[PDB]
């Protein structure tokens, strides 16, 4: 509350560390469905169904330009990528499996880097 604060966690490396995670997600062999925004002209149903499209290149530009206020807003966008994927793709599909794999890969890096 006013003039009552928990001890100050060092957040000075968070930007660099999110960048490293994101590089590791970019270079994963199963990243290919997620590298670029879904082409809304060429994929019927995407625009109407997926209310907030998100992809790794868009996260990279947001990260690089100071549009994440803290590491939690960064994780919310990464998770959005996988939540969108599950919304649109059957589990038993190459893309559906890719999204589960990448979400797992992310969540472990997230826990190991920050928890």
């Amino acid at each position: 509350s006013m003039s009552v604060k928990k001890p100050k966690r060092d957040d000075s490396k968070d930007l660099a560390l999110c960048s490293m995670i994101l590089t590791e997600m970019e270079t994963h062999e199963d990243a290919w469905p997620f590298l670029l925004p879904v082409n809304l002209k060429l994929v019927p149903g995407y625009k109407k169904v997926i209310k907030k499209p998100m992809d790794f290149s868009t996260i990279r530009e947001k990260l690089s330009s100071g549009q994440y206020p803290n590491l939690e807003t960064f994780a919310l966008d990464v998770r959005l990528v996988f939540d969108n994927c599950e919304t649109f793709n059957e589990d038993d599909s190459d893309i559906g499996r890719a999204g589960h794999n990448m979400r797992k890969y992310f969540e472990k890096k997230w826990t190991d880097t920050f928890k």
Side-chain angles (χ1 to χ4, degrees), residues 1-7 9-12 14-114:
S1 70
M2 196 185 331
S3 308
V4 187
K5 292 303 172 320
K6 297 196 185 51
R9 182 205 168 248
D10 184 11
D11 66 343
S12 62
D14 286 0
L15 186 62
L17 284 157
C18 288
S19 181
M20 286 172 56
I21 298 171
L22 181 57
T23 295
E24 295 165 357
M25 276 195 310
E26 292 167 332
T27 59
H28 191 296
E29 74 162 292
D30 300 341
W32 60 266
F34 313 114
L35 296 176
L36 299 177
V38 175
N39 181 335
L40 302 177
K41 304 171 194 298
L42 302 180
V43 178
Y46 211 85
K47 191 167 196 297
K48 185 63 179 276
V49 174
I50 302 292
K51 299 308 177 175
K52 288 175 71 167
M54 190 46 62
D55 67 283
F56 294 167
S57 78
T58 300
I59 297 173
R60 171 70 72 191
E61 183 63 34
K62 284 180 67 170
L63 193 61
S64 292
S65 65
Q67 296 185 62
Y68 291 119
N70 56 54
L71 84 167
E72 300 308 332
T73 61
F74 169 83
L76 281 167
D77 266 355
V78 178
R79 291 168 181 148
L80 178 64
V81 173
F82 311 125
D83 293 347
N84 288 348
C85 183
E86 278 197 53
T87 291
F88 211 78
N89 295 262
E90 276 294 340
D91 296 342
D92 190 9
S93 68
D94 294 277
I95 292 170
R97 279 186 287 278
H100 288 292
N101 285 355
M102 296 299 307
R103 180 196 300 273
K104 186 87 176 171
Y105 188 72
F106 173 66
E107 294 300 350
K108 164 116 153 79
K109 304 278 183 185
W110 191 251
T111 293
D112 292 354
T113 302
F114 293 117

